[PDB]
Design a protein around this nucleic acid. Structure first.
Length: 36
DNA sequence: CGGGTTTTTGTCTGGCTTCACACTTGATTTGCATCACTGTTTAAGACAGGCCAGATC
């Protein structure tokens, strides 16, 4: 388990309740993990 | 001989199932190359001069 490991799923529902899909949901989550 | 009785298949539309699989991104494993290092000559056999020594005219 790494940062993105426990960051792609722990914050997954925060976009999965908006994005039905499951790449596009965590996609912008990767961008907000990269910005920081 | 061609026609007929077995094994073997297509076959139903439903709901079921396990699981491959989309889509990132870094932390691991795994593959395959490199790398620095080691052994520390002869031994038979052919041919040639050359020196010497004994033979011969």
């Amino acid at each position: 388990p790494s940062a993105f490991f426990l960051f792609c799923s722990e914050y997954r529902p925060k976009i999965k309740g908006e994005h039905p899909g499951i790449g596009d949901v965590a996609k912008k989550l990767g961008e907000m993990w990269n910005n920081t």
